[PDB]
C-alpha cells in the first residue's frame, strides 16, 4: 500500500471517476445541511481556520463531504480518513478528492485516504496516512475524531516513545489489537519520535461520537490527555437528534438494503435504551414491530417500559428474536452461546460503534460456516442445528456499512456542532486547559435555530416582561445548564 | 431484439450469470414466503397445474422469483415478463431462468423476458414474449396479470382482428400508446388472428392490484370479457395486507434508496387515502414526519382527519410540501402547474401502478431541464424559476423502481392467493362464467392462519357453545360477506 | 312496586328532573359537536318526514341520544324510551329530553322516557316493556330504534310465545336475565294475550344500531322469524369504522381514568377480540405507553394485530401477566373463573362489548369470593384461597358507558346520523323494503362522512369531467365498489 | 374562618364521612405505589424522620395521602394544605384526617386544610394554618412544596417582618396579590416576627415542580433563601416520567372529564414543548389529533418538528384550534385578544403550574359572559360575535381541577424522590448550605429500580469486565452527571 499523487494532492480511494455522481449528490447534500452553509457564509471573509492543519477520522461518507468542504472554506487544511472499514462512500470520496472545480485527471480537493470495505490492515494505513503531514515542522495541529482512533493511535505511540518500547501482543489480543501495534513497532524502528511532536504540534481534538467520548475521559483520569478536547457528542444538538433521531431513520434503512425483511409483525431485540436504542426502538415500533429492549440502567429501562416496551435479558428473549440489534456502546452483547440460540434466518446487526457488541470473534471459531450473500451481508450456518443468522457488516454498524448513514438534515446538527468546536479551540486556544469540555448552551441553540428555520418552524419571541418572568435574555439562553431535554 | 435460446429455453434479460446471488436471495426468501412454501408441500403430489401454460405479467422479483416456482412445482409451464420497466431485480431474473438446479451454462428454469430498465418498446416486446407460447396449437391457457397489460394485449389484440384494421394511433396519443398500437399492427400484417386464438385457449386471468382489476370490471360492462378472471387484489389477505402494510414497508425504502432524504421533520403530502396511501401516510407518521392528504372520498377523507391528518388540495399545499407521494389509481394528480410550484429541491414521486399520476409528459415537454444524478433518480431545473425538482423512477412505482418492492413476508399472502386462484381457476373452469370474481372467505382466512403461524401466533379456538353462539363453525369462515376488517 | 310517573301529561321514570337544565346546557354544546344530526334537522325541517311515527327507542340514555331523540321529533316523530343498559344513563340527560327545549321541570315539554343510572335487572326490563308500550292500544308504536335487539327481541319473542299460547319455565340455571326477560312475558299473558303480536304487526321496521343486534336480527331472519323490515345500521362505512373503532379509542381509557385512575404507561394489557372495538382498544392503549397483547379466534383480525405490533395470545397463557384486561368479541364466555383466579392482584377486568357473558360475572358471584363496593360500578372481589383481589368495572357491562360517559359527540355524530337516516328511509319507503335485513346505500355513507370532514375543516378534492370518467364513477359519487372494505 | 378540632387534630375539610370511601381508593393506591411502599418498609425500625415537623404545600390527593403517611411511618409530624384552589381530593383529604385507624368520630390522622373548590381568602388561611404549628417553641422545621407557596409565604413574610412594614397593595394588583398581603399584613399587626422565627425553623425545604424551582433560583439568586432546598422535580425520575408521562396521562383525562369532546380528527395547539408539552403533544397524538406545538427555545422546536408537530405561533394557529393547551410554566401565553379569535367551542385549558397563563383577568373584564356548566366547565360568550369558549378549571392547573392529577404508579416516582429528599434534608443536615441542590444519580436510578421491577422488567447485570470497559461500578451509577436520559 502506497499513497497516489495527482497534481499535488496524495491520497487512496476506490475510484477518481465517482466524482461526478459524488459532486451531484454533493451539492443535493448542500440544500439538506443548512448548518454547515449557514456557517460558510457567516465565516467567510473572517477565515477562522486559517492556520489550521485538520486530522479527520470520521466515515467518508456525502455528508463528510460538505463538512470537508466547509472545514476548507473557513481556512482549515485537511486530510482525511473514515472511521471505519465500511462506512465510505466512494462517490463522496472522489468529489472530495477533486474539489468542486477539479477533475479526475487535475484534482483540486483534499488528500483522502478511505474507500469502502478496506481490510483492518489499509485501515490503520490510512489512518497513520491521515495524521502524517508533508512537511514535519509543520504537523497536525488538530484533530478531528469519531470514535477516538485518531486520539488513540497519537496518545499511545507517544507512550511507547516515552516509554522506549512498543509492546508484543500476545494471542486474545483483538486482530485489530495486533494490526494497531504493527503499525506502531515498525514506525519506531525508523522514527523514535513520531507521534509525540504530533502530539505537542496539536491544539486540541474534537470528538463526535458517545464511545470516542467514553475513551477521551480514561485519558483525562489517568493523567493523559495531552490536549483539550471538545465533546461534541454531548451537544444537545447532537445527541439529542443524530444519535436518536438520526439512527430512526438510518436503522431501517441499513436493514432493508442488507435483507428486504418484513418488520411489521416481527419480535425485534434492541439491546440498549439510550439515545440510539430510542432511535432504534421507535423506528422499529413506527414500521409494526413487537419490539421489546435489554437495559442495565434502571432509569433507560423505565422509559423503555413507559414507550410500550417489554425490557428483557438476551438470554429469555434471544431465542425467539426474528431481528437482534445491539445498541449498547458496550462489549459482549451478543456471545456466541446466544447466536447458537438464535432461530433460523433471525436478523443479526450491531449499530454501536464497535465490532465487539458481538461476539464475532467467537463465531468465526465456531465452526459455523459463512456464505457471503452480497456486499455486507452474511449468512452463518451452524451444522448441529441447521439453523443460519443473517449477520450484518460482519457486527460492525450496519447503518453506514450496509446503507449510507443518517441523513443530510441530521448531519447538519452534528458537523454544525463539529466546525464550530474546531473554531472554538483553534481562534481561543489558551481559553482550554487539558480537559473534555462541551460547548455552551447559546451555540447549541444557535445550531437548532438554523434547522428550525430550515424547516419552517415558527418561532414565538419571548416579550420583555415574559423574560423578566423566566430570568432570560430574550435572545437566549432559555434554559438551566443541566436541562436534559 | 430478438430473444437468446440456451439449452432449449428462450429468454431476455440482464445477465445471466447473476443467477447464484438470486438463487441465494431466492433460498432466504422462502423462508420469509410460509404461504408460498406450504402450498408447494399441499400440492406436491396433486400436482393441480398440470397441462397449464401461464403466461405471467408481474414484476420480475425475487418475490416473484418464488411464485413462479411454486407454480412450477405444482406442475405448469410458464412463461413471464414484468409489469414495469423498472421493477425487475436482475439478480432474481437470472435464478429464474437457470432454475434451482442448473447453472448458467447448462440452465434448467423457464422463459423469461425481463429486465431493469427497459424501454417502452422493449417492454411491449418483452409482453409479446410472454404471451407468445413455441407451439402454435399450443397458445397460453393462463394469464397471471398484474396491472392488466397482458389482459388488454388480448383483448384489444382479438379486438382489432375481428374489426379487419388496428386504428391509427392521434398524434396526441400518449407515447406508450403509440407503442402499444404499433406492436399489434405490425403483427396483424403477418398473423390476421393471434389474438384471438390466443384468448379463445385462455380459460382464465388472475389479478394482483386495484388499477388493473379496475381495467377488468371495465371490459366485463362493455360485455368484452372473454374469459372468467379472480379479482385477486381484494382478497382480505391482499388488499388489507399487501397495499397497506406492504407499502408502510416498502415506500421508505424506496426514498432512502433514491433520495437519502430526512423524512422526520418534513411536510409530506400523501394524494390519496385508499390502502397505499394509509400506509403511506402511516410510514411517515412512524418516522416523523408531518403529514398531510388529498381525497376525493368523504369516507376515506374522514379516516384521514381520525388519523390525524390534515385533508388538504394539492393547490393549498403543494407550496409548502417537501414530499408529494401520489397515491390514487387516477390519472392527473400532479400536473405541471403543480410541480412548477413545489419548493426547491422537493421530492416527488408516484407509488400507484401507472406514471400517469404524475404530469410525466408535461414535465419531459416544458422545458426543464434534467439531470440525472442516478438509476432512477432526476433533477429537474426551471430555469424561470430556478428552482429544482427530485423525481423518483420517472413517475413509476417508485417502490419497485427505486427500491425492492414490498417484502417477501408480505408478497406471501398475495401470492399465495394468486396461487390459490390460479389452482381454482384452472382445476374448475366450469364452475366459472365470463365475469370478474373475488375468492371465498375460508381460502383468504386460510392464507391468514399460515402467516400467524409463521409469525408465532397463537389463535384461540371457538368451544361449542361459542361457536353455536356466533352462528358459525369453529373452523368456518368466521364473519359475514359484506364484513370490512 | 314500580309505577311510572307523569307531569303534565308526560309518563316516564328517571332519577331526577331537576337535572334538565344541566343536561340542557350539555345537550346544547353537544349539538355544536354533532354537525351530522344538525344538518338532518335543517334539511328535513319543513318535510316533517317523520310525522305519524311513533319511535320506540332501546339506546343508552346519553347526551348524544338525547341530540338524536330532538332530532327525530324536530322531524314529525313521536318517541317512548328507555336505555339498553342498566348503567348507561345520563341522569342530566335523561332529565333534558323529559323537560324538552323549552319545558321547565314543573311544565315539562319533553318526550316520554324510562332510565336512569343504576337499574336492576327487572327495573330495566319493566322500564323497556313502558317504552314500547304505547298509551293507545289502538295507536301501538310503528317503528323501533334499538342498540342491541332488546326491543325487537321483547317483541320478536313475545309474539311467538303468545302463539305459541304460553311462556316457557326458566331452568335452575337460567341466566338472572332470562328469568327476568320471562317473568316479565309471563306476567303480561296473564291478563294480555295478544299485546306483543298486535305491536309487531304496528312496527314497520326496526333500526339496529350494533354489531350485537345485528347477528340477533340475522338469526331472527335465517329463522324466518324477522316480521317487519330491518336496517343494519352497525355496518354503515361511517358507524362500524369510525363508532366502534375511533369511538372506543376515546371512550375505552376515558372508562378506566373513570373507574380506576391506574397509569396505563408500562403495563401489560390483554386485549380479547380484534373487531373494530377490539382495534380501538388496542389503538387507544398503544398511545398511552401499555404493553398489548391480543387475543383472537380469527387469523384475519389476528395477522392485523400482528402487523400492528401487538402479540396474538390466548387468555390462559396471557392471564397472569396482564395488569388490564378488556373483552371486546361479541361472544361469551372469555374470561371464565378459572381466568379471573389467574388474574395477578389488583388487575383490573373489563368488558367493552354489548352485553356482560363476555366475563364470566354468574361465575364469579357464585365463587365465594367477597365484593367490596369501591364506589358506583367499580368493585373489587377477594378470593380468600389464593388472598388476591380483582378490580370489575361496571359489574361486567360495559365499561366505557358504565364508568364513562361512552363515545364522544363528534363520533356519535356520525352513528346517529344514519340511524336518522335509516329511520327516514324505512318510514317514507316502507313499500319497498322486504322482511329481511339492509343495509344503507353507499351514497348515504357518502353524505354522512362529508358533513364531518367539512365540520372538521378538511378540504375534499373534486374530480374533472376525466378522472371520474376514467374512474367510472360520477364526480359526486358513489366513489368505491360495493364490497369495497376502507 | 376558624379550624375545627377532633380527638387532639385540628383540621378544615370538606366532610370527614368520606373517610371510608377515602380508605378504600388509598389501599388501592399503594398497590400502585411501589415507591412509597418500599421505603416504609427499608425505613421502618430506623425511623429516619422522628424530630421532623413537616409543613406540606402539595396537592391533596389521593396519591399525596400514601406521601403523608410514608412520612408519618418514618416518623414525621405533619400538617398540611393544598397548593391548588380545585386540586384536592375531599375523600383523601377525609382518610388522611382519620388515619388508617381512626373513624370519622375519633380521627387517628394528620391535619389537613383542604378542600374542593377554595376562594382565593380560603386557600391562604390554609395556608398559614398548615404553616402554623400549635407549640410557639416548636413551629415547623421542615417544608415540602409544590409551586413555591409555602417557601413564599415564609420568606415574604420575614422580609415584611425585617421592614417593619408589609406594603400596602396597589387597587389594580393580581387578586391573588392583594389576599397573600391582607394575610401577612394582619398576622404582622399581633405578631411581629411570626415568620422570621419560622425561617430559622426550618432546616430545608424539598420543592416538587419545575415552577416552584424557578421561584428558588430567584431567591438564591438575591441571597434571600434562608435555608437548603432540594429540586426534586430535576431528578431524572421526576422531570422525565411525571411532566412528561404523568401529564400524558392525565392531560387527557381532565379534557373527557370537563368536556368530553372527541379529540382524534381535531386541531390541539399545545403551547410549551417541555417535558410537559411532550407529554400533551404525546396524548393528543395518539388519541387522533392533529397537533401543532408553539415554543421559544429553538432546541425544544427541533424535537416538535422531528416528532411530526408543526411549530406555530398562537397568532398564527389561534383561529382554527379546536382544544388549546398552554404548557409553558410562562405567562401571557393566551391573552383576552387571543381568547376572541377563537373559534366557536373551543376549548381552553391550562396545565402549567398557576393560572395566568391564560388571561384569566382580562377575560372577566372583557365583557365576555360567563355561564357555569358544571365544577370547573365553564362556557364564556361574546355578545359582539355570538362565539362561545369552553374554559377548564378557570384555569389553573386542568388536570388536577377537572380530573385527578396523574395516576398513582407516576407520583410513586414523584413521592419517591420526595421523601428521600426529605430523609437526606433533615438527617444529614449540616452537609447542606443555603442553595439549591439535585438528588444524587444513585438514589434516581435507585427510584427507578424500584418500579422497573414493579411492572415486570428485568434488567441485565453488568460483568465484571463489562462495568471495567466502562468505568462504571456493577450497581450504578451508570451515567455521568450531564447525561439527558
Ligand atoms: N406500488 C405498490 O407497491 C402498490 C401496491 C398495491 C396497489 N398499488 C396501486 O396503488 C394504487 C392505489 O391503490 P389502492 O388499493 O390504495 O386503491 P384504493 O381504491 O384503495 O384508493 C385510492 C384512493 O385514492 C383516492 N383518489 C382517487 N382520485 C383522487 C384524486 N384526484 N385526488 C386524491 N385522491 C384520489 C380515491 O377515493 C381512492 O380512495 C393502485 O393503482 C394500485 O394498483 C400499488
Ligand atoms: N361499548 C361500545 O361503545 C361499543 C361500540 C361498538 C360496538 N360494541 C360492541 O362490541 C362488540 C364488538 O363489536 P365489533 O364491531 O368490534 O365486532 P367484530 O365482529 O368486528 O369483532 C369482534 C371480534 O371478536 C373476535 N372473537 C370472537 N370470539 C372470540 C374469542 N373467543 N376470543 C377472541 N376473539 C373472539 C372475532 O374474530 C371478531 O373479529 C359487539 O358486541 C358490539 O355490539 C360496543
Same mark, same amino acid.
Given at each position: 500500500?502506497?499513497?497516489?499523487?495527482?497534481?499535488?494532492?496524495?491520497?487512496?480511494?476506490?475510484?477518481?471517476?465517482?466524482?461526478?455522481?459524488?459532486?451531484?449528490?454533493?451539492?443535493?447534500?448542500?440544500?439538506?445541511?443548512?448548518?454547515?452553509?449557514?456557517?460558510?457564509?457567516?465565516?467567510?471573509?473572517?477565515?477562522?481556520?486559517?492556520?489550521?492543519?485538520?486530522?479527520?477520522?470520521?466515515?467518508?461518507?456525502?455528508?463528510?463531504?460538505?463538512?470537508?468542504?466547509?472545514?476548507?472554506?473557513?481556512?482549515?487544511?485537511?486530510?482525511?480518513?473514515?472511521?471505519?472499514?465500511?462506512?465510505?462512500?466512494?462517490?463522496?470520496?472522489?468529489?472530495?478528492?477533486?474539489?468542486?472545480?477539479?477533475?479526475?485527471?487535475?484534482?483540486?480537493?483534499?488528500?483522502?485516504?478511505?474507500?469502502?470495505?478496506?481490510?483492518?490492515?489499509?485501515?490503520?494505513?490510512?489512518?497513520?496516512?491521515?495524521?502524517?503531514?508533508?512537511?514535519?515542522?509543520?504537523?497536525?495541529?488538530?484533530?478531528?475524531?469519531?470514535?477516538?482512533?485518531?486520539?488513540? *493511535?497519537?496518545?499511545?505511540?507517544?507512550?511507547?516513545?516515552?516509554?522506549?518500547?512498543?509492546?508484543?501482543?500476545?494471542?486474545?489480543?483483538?486482530?485489530?489489537?495486533?494490526?494497531?501495534?504493527?503499525?506502531?513497532?515498525?514506525?519506531?524502528?525508523?522514527?523514535?519520535?513520531?507521534?509525540?511532536?504530533?502530539?505537542?504540534?496539536?491544539?486540541?481534538?474534537?470528538?463526535?461520537?458517545?464511545?470516542?467520548? @467514553?475513551?477521551?475521559?480514561?485519558?483525562?483520569?489517568?493523567?493523559?490527555?495531552?490536549?483539550?478536547?471538545?465533546?461534541?457528542?454531548?451537544?444537545?444538538?447532537?445527541?439529542?437528534?443524530?444519535?436518536?433521531?438520526?439512527?430512526?431513520?438510518? @436503522?431501517?434503512?441499513?436493514?432493508?438494503?442488507?435483507?428486504?425483511?418484513?418488520?411489521?409483525?416481527?419480535?425485534? *431485540?434492541?439491546?440498549?435504551?439510550?439515545?440510539?436504542?430510542?432511535?432504534?426502538?421507535?423506528?422499529?415500533?413506527?414500521?409494526?414491530?413487537?419490539?421489546?429492549?435489554?437495559?442495565?440502567?434502571?432509569?433507560?429501562?423505565?422509559?423503555?417500559?413507559?414507550?410500550?416496551?417489554?425490557?428483557?435479558?438476551?438470554?429469555?428473549?434471544?431465542?425467539?428474536?426474528?431481528?437482534?440489534?445491539?445498541?449498547?456502546?458496550?462489549?459482549?452483547?451478543?456471545?456466541?452461546?446466544?447466536?447458537?440460540?438464535?432461530?433460523?434466518?433471525?436478523?443479526?446487526?450491531?449499530?454501536?460503534?464497535?465490532?465487539?457488541?458481538?461476539?464475532?470473534?467467537?463465531?468465526?471459531?465456531?465452526?459455523?460456516?459463512?456464505?457471503?450473500?452480497?456486499?455486507?451481508?452474511?449468512?452463518?450456518?451452524?451444522?448441529?442445528?441447521?439453523?443460519?443468522?443473517?449477520?450484518?457488516?460482519?457486527?460492525? *454498524?450496519?447503518?453506514?456499512?450496509?446503507?449510507?448513514?443518517?441523513?443530510?438534515?441530521?448531519?447538519?446538527?452534528?458537523?454544525?456542532?463539529?466546525?464550530?468546536?474546531?473554531?472554538?479551540?483553534?481562534?481561543?486556544?489558551?481559553?482550554?486547559?487539558?480537559?473534555?469540555?462541551?460547548?455552551?448552551?447559546?451555540?447549541?441553540?444557535?445550531?437548532?435555530?438554523?434547522?428550525?428555520?430550515? *424547516?419552517?418552524?415558527? @418561532?414565538?419571541?419571548?416579550?420583555?416582561?415574559?423574560?423578566?418572568?423566566?430570568?432570560?435574555?430574550?435572545?437566549?439562553?432559555?434554559?438551566?445548564?443541566?436541562?436534559?431535554?
Amino acid at each position: 500500500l502506497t499513497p497516489d499523487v495527482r497534481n499535488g494532492i496524495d491520497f487512496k480511494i476506490a475510484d477518481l471517476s465517482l466524482a461526478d455522481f459524488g459532486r451531484k449528490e454533493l451539492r443535493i447534500a448542500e440544500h439538506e445541511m443548512p448548518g454547515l452553509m449557514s456557517l460558510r457564509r457567516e465565516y467567510a471573509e473572517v477565515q477562522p481556520l486559517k492556520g489550521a492543519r485538520i486530522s479527520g477520522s470520521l466515515h467518508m461518507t456525502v455528508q463528510t463531504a460538505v463538512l470537508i468542504e466547509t472545514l476548507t472554506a473557513l481556512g482549515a487544511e485537511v486530510r482525511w480518513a473514515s472511521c471505519n472499514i465500511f462506512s465510505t462512500q466512494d462517490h463522496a470520496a472522489a468529489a472530495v478528492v477533486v474539489g468542486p472545480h477539479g477533475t479526475p485527471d487535475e484534482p483540486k480537493g483534499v488528500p483522502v485516504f478511505a474507500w469502502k470495505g478496506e481490510t483492518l490492515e489499509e485501515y490503520w494505513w490510512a489512518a497513520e496516512q491521515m495524521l502524517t503531514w508533508p512537511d514535519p515542522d509543520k504537523p497536525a495541529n488538530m484533530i478531528l475524531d469519531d470514535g477516538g482512533d485518531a486520539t488513540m *493511535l497519537v496518545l499511545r505511540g507517544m507512550q511507547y516513545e516515552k516509554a522506549g518500547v512498543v509492546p508484543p501482543a500476545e494471542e486474545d489480543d483483538p486482530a485489530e489489537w495486533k494490526v494497531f501495534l504493527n503499525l506502531l513497532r515498525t514506525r519506531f524502528e525508523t522514527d523514535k519520535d513520531k507521534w509525540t511532536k504530533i502530539a505537542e504540534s496539536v491544539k486540541g481534538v474534537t470528538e463526535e461520537t458517545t464511545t470516542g467520548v @467514553l475513551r477521551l475521559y480514561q485519558f483525562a483520569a489517568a493523567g493523559d490527555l495531552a490536549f483539550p478536547a471538545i465533546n461534541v457528542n454531548d451537544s444537545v444538538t447532537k445527541s439529542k437528534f443524530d444519535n436518536k433521531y438520526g439512527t430512526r431513520h438510518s @436503522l431501517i434503512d441499513g436493514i432493508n438494503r442488507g435483507t428486504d425483511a418484513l418488520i411489521g409483525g416481527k419480535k425485534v *431485540l434492541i439491546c440498549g435504551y439510550g439515545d440510539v436504542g430510542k432511535g432504534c426502538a421507535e423506528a422499529m415500533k413506527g414500521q409494526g414491530a413487537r419490539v421489546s429492549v435489554t437495559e442495565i440502567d434502571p432509569i433507560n429501562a423505565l422509559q423503555a417500559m413507559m414507550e410500550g416496551f417489554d425490557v428483557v435479558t438476551v438470554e429469555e428473549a434471544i431465542g425467539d428474536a426474528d431481528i437482534v440489534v445491539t445498541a449498547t456502546g458496550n462489549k459482549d452483547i451478543i456471545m456466541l452461546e446466544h447466536i447458537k440460540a438464535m432461530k433460523d434466518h433471525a436478523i443479526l446487526g450491531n449499530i454501536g460503534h464497535f465490532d465487539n457488541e458481538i461476539d464475532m470473534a467467537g463465531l468465526e471459531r465456531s465452526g459455523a460456516t459463512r456464505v457471503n450473500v452480497k456486499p455486507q451481508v452474511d449468512l452463518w450456518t451452524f451444522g448441529d442445528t441447521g439453523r443460519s443468522i443473517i449477520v450484518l457488516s460482519e457486527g460492525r *454498524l450496519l447503518n453506514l456499512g450496509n446503507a449510507t448513514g443518517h441523513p443530510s438534515f441530521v448531519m447538519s446538527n452534528s458537523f454544525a456542532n463539529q466546525t464550530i468546536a474546531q473554531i472554538e479551540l483553534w481562534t481561543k486556544n489558551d481559553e482550554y486547559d487539558n480537559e473534555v469540555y462541551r460547548l455552551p448552551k447559546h451555540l447549541d441553540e444557535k445550531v437548532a435555530r438554523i434547522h428550525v428555520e430550515a *424547516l419552517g418552524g415558527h @418561532l414565538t419571541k419571548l416579550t420583555k416582561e415574559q423574560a423578566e418572568y423566566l430570568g432570560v435574555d430574550v435572545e437566549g439562553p432559555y434554559k438551566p445548564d443541566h436541562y436534559r431535554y
